[PDB]
UniProtKB/Swiss-Prot annotation:
Boundaries of every YTH domain copy: 12-146
Residues bearing the modification Phosphoserine: S81, S89
Name this polypeptide is given: YTH domain-containing protein 1
Domain notes: The YTH domain mediates RNA-binding.
Entire protein: shown range: 345 to 507 of 727
Gene (name only): YTHDC1
Effect of W34D: Abolishes RNA-binding and ability to influence alternative splice site selection
Outcome of mutating F66D: Abolishes RNA-binding and ability to influence alternative splice site selection
Recorded consequence of changing D130K: Does not affect ability to influence alternative splice site selection
Record's subunit section: Interacts with SRSF1. Interacts with SRSF2. Interacts with SRSF3. Interacts with SRSF7. Interacts with SRSF10. Interacts with CPSF6. Interacts with KHDRBS1/SAM68. Interacts with TRA2B. Interacts with KHDRBS3. Interacts with EMD. Interacts with RBMX. Interacts with ZCCHC8.
Binding positions for RNA per the UniProt entry: K18, S19, N20, W34, S35, W85, D130
PTM text: Tyrosine phosphorylated.
């Protein structure tokens, strides 16, 4: 069902995450981690303390799709391990967030064309820089568009809130 998903998304904050390549999203799905530039790291750390759930919605640049969404389980932390990100530096992409995936399935941008983001001038929600916040109602509807991921049990996610 979608009931536990809706519960997780209640009063959540949502952020668009743009990855330059598929490799880093694969690594994030395997290890439950994300790292971003310092400007966005600061925003996500503030958001993490401010909301019951902070949701990252991932899109690989030029893919025409979102690749899934995940909930922050922690603020960023340094000195944990050397995530072998594919970079275009390691110091900049420093500070690692732990994340729990809610959906690892893709959603093509063609399916979200009816959703606009008030916090980005009501442009289609697919449009935004890395770290762009997505208003609650837009973000909720976007997450509900993804195919259900029946490999994920939201029970343990709920327990962390």
């Amino acid at each position: 069902g979608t009931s536990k998903l809706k519960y997780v998304l209640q009063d959540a904050r949502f952020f668009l995450i743009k990855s330059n390549n598929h490799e880093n999203v694969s690594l994030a799905k395997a290890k439950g981690v994300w790292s971003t530039l310092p400007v966005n790291e600061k925003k996500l750390n503030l958001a993490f303390r401010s909301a019951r759930s902070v949701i990252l919605i991932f899109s690989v640049r030029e893919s025409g799709k979102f690749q899934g969404f995940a909930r922050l389980s922690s603020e960023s932390h340094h000195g944990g391990s050397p995530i072998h990100w594919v970079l275009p530096s390691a110091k900049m992409l420093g500070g690692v967030f732990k994340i729990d995936w809610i959906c690892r399935r893709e959603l093509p941008f063609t399916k979200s064309a009816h959703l606009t983001n008030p916090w980005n001038e009501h442009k289609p929600v697919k449009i935004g820089r890395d770290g762009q916040e997505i208003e609650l109602e837009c973000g909720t509807q976007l997450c509900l568009l993804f195919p259900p991921d029946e490999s994920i049990d939201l029970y343990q996610v709920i327990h962390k809130m």
